[PDB]
Design a protein around this ligand. Sequence first.
Ligand SMILES: NC(=O)c1cc([N+](=O)[O-])ccc1NCc1ccc(O)cc1
Length: 294
Amino acid sequence: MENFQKVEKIGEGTYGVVYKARNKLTGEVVALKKIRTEGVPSTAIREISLLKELNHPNIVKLLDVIHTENKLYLVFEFLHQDLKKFMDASALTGIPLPLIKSYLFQLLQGLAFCHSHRVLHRDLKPQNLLINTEGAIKLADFGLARAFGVPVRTYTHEVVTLWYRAPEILLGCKYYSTAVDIWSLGCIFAEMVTRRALFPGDSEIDQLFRIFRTLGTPDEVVWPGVTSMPDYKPSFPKWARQDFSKVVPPLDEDGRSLLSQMLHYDPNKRISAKAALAHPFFQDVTKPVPHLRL
Ligand SMILES: NC(=O)c1cc([N+](=O)[O-])ccc1NCc1ccc(O)cc1
């Protein structure tokens, strides 16, 4: 709009183009997201508007929702870097364990807050985890998935990443629960530790089979009800579960314990954000400041 002087093109999310913009008046620097079509559902705008009240230090603030000419703009507080970029920049030496722990602890606080307010993310990934020079990390796009929906790609021929998708979503479950976010975060925690994606599937089935190959093909024993799920097939190969010690070496037993609880197959057995915060892994948590090159 004419109220913003597009500084640059921050990128192209799974909803639309994102710009770093400066408020001509306030001078405020923000992230402006133009949402993808021909009318804008009033149900969507109401849902979105509710999110302006969902404020927490570990949640990227949604400053404004602007509906105009079949176009919807979301104005968000701006942060200089995402975790995907930071991990790549830290690929040679790895992110120090104290910082990994701090980030996981903060992300869990953010999740606990949203979940206590009955708001789910549903599409957590390194790119929507934003960080600043203060050692803070925040979750971006909370609640957008429900307020809207999800197509085959993003909106314009852009492959949607499935690497962080919970198995219940992959097996066709129609009702998501807060557990899907814990799964995604577990996958991200593993990636920060090993410096490699945990389950980098390139198709829905490859995603599911990569999970099965590591955690074992689920059955009625570990996941009651799994064989009755929409896309479950009796023909799925039966893989034995691997040792966590081989999954995220050289993570210590406190870390491996927490991760295994975040990756339980049964959404109901999967640990909650609130409960994870009390896990012994965080007994010595601190808040280190990252070396950020902007
Ligand atoms: N709220 C935000 O600040 C932000 C928003 C989205 N987004 O998709 O809504 C993506 C990245 C973001 N910042 C990190 C960033 C900043 C500058 C860059 O050049 C690249 C990444």
